[PDB]
Structure formats: C-alpha cells, structure tokens
DNA sequence: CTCTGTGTTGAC
DNA sequence: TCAACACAGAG
C-alpha cells in the first residue's frame, strides 16, 4: 500500500498509479503537475530546472552540454511562472511549437 | 463526487 | 534542498 518512489528527480508517486512532479526553490516547493507517465514528469522537472537555474543544471535526461538552442530562447523568453503553468497544463510542447513558427 | 497538491516533518 | 505521507479542500 506504500506508494512507489522515482528513479528520477523531482518525481513523486500520486496515490491512483499516477506521478507528480516538484522543484524547489528556496524553502518553497513548486508543484509542476501530476501526469501519468514517471517519465513525463521527469521531463517537467528538467524543463522547470532549466529555466530556474540554467543551461548547467542536472537533469533527468538532458545533456548539460547545450549551452545557446531554442529551447534556451523559449525559457528566457518567459517567466518562471509562466513555464510552471505551462507545465502544470501539458501545454508546453505546443506553445514552444508556435514559438518557433516564427 | 474525484483526486490534486498542500501541510508537515525529517533525513541530508 | 529534497521526498514521504496524510488528507484538507480545490475542481
């Protein structure tokens, strides 16, 4: 009945199977969303920890070695929450396609 | 009604 | 900074 942990950072077990995800900042959690994949919220996280403490951070899957991309132009071009509510309503992917459309 | 995500605590 | 766990209260 206790609930499974993540291989990955910033993952946590939702009760019904599904996973949430949390950076912190300071003393204060910032909750991400709940997904049903483990490896969905794990790339949430490393979204959120890419724009919260940069290109040199340590993620889950991401490289550390690409330091100026597109993606580096989408999160400096938002704001922190912004992102975070991007997150939180699986809308990122979409909203960084019609970014690029430019 | 469902179930997120906040409150809280304790390791590190 | 971090996650484990219970369950207030958001939707």
């Given at each position: 009945?206790?609930?499974?942990?993540?291989?990955?950072k910033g993952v946590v077990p939702q009760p019904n199977?599904?996973?949430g995800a949390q950076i912190y900042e300071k003393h204060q959690r910032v909750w991400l969303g709940t997904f049903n994949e483990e490896?969905?919220?794990?790339?949430?996280?490393?979204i959120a920890v890419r724009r919260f403490?940069?290109?040199?951070?340590?993620?889950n899957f991401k490289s550390q070695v690409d330091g100026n991309d597109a993606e580096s132009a989408?999160?400096?071009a938002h704001s922190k929450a912004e992102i975070v509510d991007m997150?939180?309503?699986?809308?990122?992917?979409?909203?960084?396609?019609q970014s690029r459309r430019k």
């Open positions: 009945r206790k609930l499974p942990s993540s291989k990955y199977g599904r996973w490896e969905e919220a794990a790339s949430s996280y490393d403490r940069g290109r040199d951070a340590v993620t989408f999160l400096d997150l939180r309503k699986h809308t990122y992917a979409d909203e960084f396609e």
